[PDB]
Design a protein around this ligand. Structure first.
Ligand SMILES: CNc1cccc2cc(C(=O)Nc3cccc(CC(=O)O)c3)c(=O)[nH]c12
Length: 196
């Protein structure tokens, strides 16, 4: 019913990715996938709940963004039949994570909130299962890790550290007070962005 519109939106995006993410052969859209997710963590930092953000380039050519904010609300949003988090990750409308989720072959969500750790896995924007609790924790935050769909992205398929590094530096300048870490698991290089 609402799943109907969601899958409609997901179609829409995988069908015309240039309309939402940008160019799929350039590097431009692929890297925009990261900034869209980081964008979301910056909102949580503009709300005064997030102090540090961690962008990691993993060795299998996936990227993750971790914040120590509140964590996305997990309560089943009882108009639709699923966690508020799932609605955030899957509904269309800065374009929203659902664009990134739709063009990701795989996407892992981990939320730490009200003393629990919740995990959900998606494939091409579609949940494997409802948001489920995997254990206790005393910290809070949201972590989104995604693997770009190779059906969508070609040519430039690998993330460039210096392209992220540049945009993350810029975003730290524009949002005074946030701290951002970039780590490349491939060769160990790190950097830290913070403009007092
Ligand atoms: C990497 N981090 C990361 C990635 C992708 C998406 C998100 C989304 C959120 C998020 O929607 N958070 C949030 C927290 C509490 C209450 C509400 C509802 C509200 O009051 O506006 C929203 C986040 O925190 N982090 C995200």
């Amino acid at each position: 019913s609402s799943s109907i519109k969601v899958l409609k939106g997901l179609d829409a995006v995988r069908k015309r990715p240039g309309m939402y993410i940008g160019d799929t052969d350039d590097g431009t859209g692929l890297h925009h996938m990261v900034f869209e997710v980081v964008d979301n963590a910056i909102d949580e930092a503009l709300a005064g709940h997030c102090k540090e953000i961690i962008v990691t380039i993993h060795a299998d050519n996936s990227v993750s963004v971790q914040d120590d904010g509140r964590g996305i609300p997990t309560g089943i949003h009882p108009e639709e039949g699923v966690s508020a988090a799932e609605v955030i990750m899957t509904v269309l409308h800065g374009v929203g994570v659902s664009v990134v989720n739709a063009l990701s072959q795989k996407l892992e969500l981990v939320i730490q909130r009200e003393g629990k750790i919740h995990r959900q896995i998606y494939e091409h924007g579609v949940p494997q299962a409802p948001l489920a609790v995997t254990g206790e924790t005393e910290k809070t935050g949201t972590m989104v890790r995604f693997w770009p769909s190779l059906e969508t992205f070609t040519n430039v398929t690998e993330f460039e550290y210096e392209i992220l590094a540049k945009r993350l530096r810029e975003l730290s300048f524009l949002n005074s007070g946030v701290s951002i870490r970039l780590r490349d698991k491939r060769d160990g290089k790190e950097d830290h962005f913070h403009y007092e």
